[PDB]
From a paper:
Aside from teaming up with various ubiquitin ligases, [name] activity is linked to two specific cofactors: calcium-binding protein calmodulin ([name]) and [name] (13, 16, 17, 20, 21). Our data show that the evolutionarily conserved [name] complex forms a megadalton E4 arena, in which inward-facing ZZ-DZB domains of [name] act not as E3 ligases but as substrate receptors. The architecture of the E4 megacomplex is conserved across eukaryotes, but species-specific adaptations allow [name] to perform its precisely tuned quality-control function in diverse cellular environments.
Focused cryo-EM classification and refinement yielded density maps that resolved all folded regions of the human [name] complex (HsUBR42/KCMF12/CALM12), except the flexible C-terminal extension bearing the catalytic hemi-RING E3 module. The structural motifs that constitute the ring-like scaffold of the E4 complex were well defined by EM density, but the functional domains lining the inner cavity or extending outward into the periphery displayed high flexibility, as reflected by their lower local resolution. Finally, an extension formed by the C-terminal Armadillo repeats projects outwards from the [name] arena. This extension houses a ubiquitin-like (UBL) domain and a flexibly tethered hemi-RING module, the catalytic E4 domain, which was unresolved in the EM map.
Residue numbers in the entry:
A (entry chain B): 3983 to 4078, 4087 to 4344, 4469 to 4501
B (entry chain F): 8 to 24, 28 to 58, 62 to 77, 83 to 129, 133 to 146
C (entry chain D), D (entry chain C): 289 to 331
E (entry chain A): 3463 to 3647, 3684 to 3775, 3788 to 3982
F (entry chain B): 3463 to 3539
Write the structure that this text describes.
Amino acid sequence: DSCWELRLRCALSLFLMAVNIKTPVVVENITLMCLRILQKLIKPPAPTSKKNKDVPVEALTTVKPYCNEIHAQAQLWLKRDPKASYDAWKKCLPIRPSKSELRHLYLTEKYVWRWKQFLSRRGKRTSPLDLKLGHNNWLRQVLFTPATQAARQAACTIVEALATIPSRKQQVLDLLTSYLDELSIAGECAAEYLALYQKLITSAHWKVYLAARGVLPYVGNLITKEIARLLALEEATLSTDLQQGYALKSLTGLLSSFVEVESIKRHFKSRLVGTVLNGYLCLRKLVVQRTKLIDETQDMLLEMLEDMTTGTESETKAFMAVCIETAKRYNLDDYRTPVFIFERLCSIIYPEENEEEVYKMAGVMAQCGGLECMLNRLAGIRDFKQG
Amino acid sequence: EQIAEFKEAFSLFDKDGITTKELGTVMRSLGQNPTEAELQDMINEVDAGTIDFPEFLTMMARKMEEEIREAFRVFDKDGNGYISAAELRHVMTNLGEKLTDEEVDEMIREAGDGQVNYEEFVQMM
Amino acid sequence: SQFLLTRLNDPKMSETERQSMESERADRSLFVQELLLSTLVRE
Amino acid sequence: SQFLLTRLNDPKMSETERQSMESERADRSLFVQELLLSTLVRE
Amino acid sequence: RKAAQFVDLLGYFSLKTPQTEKKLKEYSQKAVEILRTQNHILTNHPNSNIYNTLSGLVEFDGYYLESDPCLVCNNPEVPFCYIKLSSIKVDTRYTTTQQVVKLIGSHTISKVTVKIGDLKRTKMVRTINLYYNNRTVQAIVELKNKPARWHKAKKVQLTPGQTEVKIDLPLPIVASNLMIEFADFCHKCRSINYDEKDPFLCNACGFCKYARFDFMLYAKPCCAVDPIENEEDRKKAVSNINTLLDKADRVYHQLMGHRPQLENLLCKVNEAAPEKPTSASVNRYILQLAQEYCGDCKNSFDELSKIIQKVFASRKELLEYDLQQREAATKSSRTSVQPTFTASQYRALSVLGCGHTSSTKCYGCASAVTEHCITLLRALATNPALRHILVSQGLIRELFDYNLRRGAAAMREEVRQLMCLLTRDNPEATQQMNDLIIGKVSTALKGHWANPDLASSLQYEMLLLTDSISKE
Amino acid sequence: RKAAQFVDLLGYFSLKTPQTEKKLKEYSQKAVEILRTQNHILTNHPNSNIYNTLSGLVEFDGYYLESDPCLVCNNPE
């Protein structure tokens, strides 16, 4: 009805009014209803008029939003500001080839934006906001809220709807990746969030864009921290956690999916190999509180390491050097990890069949000085039965 | 320094070791936020379907006065040296943005005679 | 079914009316999306 | 009975203490009656 | 909850011993902080709303819908009792003068009373011997290998003519199969034992011409695993642990599944919509919710608890075997010097400190902590100076705000008593409490004409006021 | 409750037949007064608390705890 603006103002006021409340009762009773209403509003029912009966929802827009600016003043609309009408927003948005024509159009657009900015600064024209979201917002609390999985699903749907324009999707994926850090905190209840991210990361181009942000290092650091926490826990007590391994398996799967990009593999395969090897070793060490999810994560890590362990001769040399360094990291008294380490090393040096050019890898080992580390480890052997 | 980052990005976006289809995405990845019209114009400028690393470097160089004068000339559609307010309205209509005639008058007023000289346009920029 | 007031529920719309309603709904959805995005901007 | 703290309540009163408590209760009852009567006076 | 005696002793010692003002203040601050933290934790429990709502409707035994099994809350104390030996019989084997029996499952026996009926003086067992094995075996005849399949428990010489003898194990023995032999000294199946002409019982039928023996044990059922001695035993244990983990994961997923249906039913019940149709007189939604929670959720919780207990036992056994092997290897290493451990170090390193806690977010554990805190505060309130200090800490506001209504009826009565005691003679505190009560009452009365629930939600305050007036 | 058909007919006649603004205002005032009086009576009913509380718990057939038997309510067809 015509009370669309007023009802929406009341609803948004209520939603933002108690969004920060963390009590389960309030979240269940008030937040869920407001979220459902907003979800119904954002995604309209499918078109019924025969003319647009199959037309896309985004297509029927009568206007086109600013490419990199949000002209809405949410605080003003909440304050029922006279200048914050929905009609005002409509008036502010634009309606919905020769090379020289294109150049003239681009120059005109740039000049018009500059003139509008100058009129805003000097005169009374309002200032549209810029596409930059904060790291702390209602979305972060709402998405990983442990109160109800239905609320998480609704929030995921709302967020997925919120990302339509590619320019919007940029900052959207940025904020989503930023929020990824809390994955360990809510290992199970955040399953929806992962589902959203994987859903949004389906675009290969978007995958490369995220890769350019250097997300791989953050993922590796998080994986290392999780592995360390798990090892400490397994070494500490004998309690049983039915949810042990969910976060680790999810992170491993996400890392593998990102690594599936062949160009990305060609880009930074070497940079990540060491983390993979250390994790595989640590997982092989895990023996006390071993979970089926942990086992699957270990298998995935081993497969990823093996796949990464296939490249140029220089790549093989780098892998050998990494193995030597990791063995240097391994303790001398330890008598388990070096087994697998040297086993893979030998398999690589002379390819195990299923003048010593096939042993040229050994020269690489001498270049790395690994032979000295080998002698040192040989010195470490003391008990024949034990080793 | 910047050249190294550009080369690294070009290598990363290079699927087979780049197509113009993701060229705008490459600029978005580099931290630059482009407009669709700007991207289309750059594509027209460059692809006289794949660009070279020197080509992307040259494009980014044009991204990092003559343009201002060309824009001023475009503003004087009649070329009378005076950019007509009605000409401004025609341009805005071409841009598809809807604005009040009173809004155009106020903008011109914010721009002695209220007639935008080339000096007036330069001072605006 | 004897209640005449019960059968009173009877709305109708033209195809052009449906198209206009769809367009208005799309515009409202866009405005809502923009407003919601504004609710999470950086400060 | 193993809970030692359960035996905490140990109240006692002298006969004079009981008489004084009775007198105080009587005074309190009289004051309460007077106050209640004041609540029903004619305006 | 097991720390009740600790709380009682702490209260008694604290009240009895005179102490410094600073010490009293520190103790009060610590106790108040503990109570406030527990209250805040309880107030935001993920299952808090569902459990609280269910509490008022159905007589609920335990919060059978927690995520991580609260082991302390999960391990009840079943007492041993006299149960007939034939009751747990699973596999039965009889010999010339010995009998081998398998139990239905592992159990911890304490003493076994064996009565001898139909006794004949011709053959009377001057002594008997027992052996136990806690190793899982498939067939009674499979354990015919005597030594490996037996670990002798006790041999008791029976005086002639004695029928009921109570062989008492000095410590309870946990086992699965037993072998009891008439150590010192067919008619039924006509199985003429050509080997043994006059055995105590038939070598095939166990038909015992000498006498008949009945047995029973003051035992409690026990869950355990056979000892792991070989590396093959280690592999079998690892496989069993993995299988148990998989089954437990399935059970946990199934149990967690019931949550959304319970939420929907709770929503329907909260509507409280009147409807027309005394065993079935209750609201259909109420009966459905009771069936779902009490029937399904309880059964799922029980199954998951059993699985978790078995998994914990298996993990403990595997850790013990691995630690024993590691210690043996260290001992073989002559260079490796044996590290003597102080008593505290030995206890800490021991596997003893492994299963003495509930879940971290165990709503039941938090509730028990709160109840113990309430009891301790009620005790500590006795010292008038302590009362003044606590009132300075402002406990009254927290008590009225959080702990006033929640908890069982006895908890509510105790809280009311403690609140009354706290304002025993403190005029300022009494004024503050009366102000809070009057404010709540007036706030309710403002919307009285509109909210029946408002009137419905003032009982506790009125009861507290009545109790306060009660104590002169 | 027997006046259901009468109510439906009155509503249909009032909606279909045009009337003066004064007539509409009078009918509105009458209906509003009736509703307000009925609501006030129900709110102040003696057994109102008991019946209301009992409503949410068990499937209630009728308010079988009234003093004066309502002939209309106590004479089923």
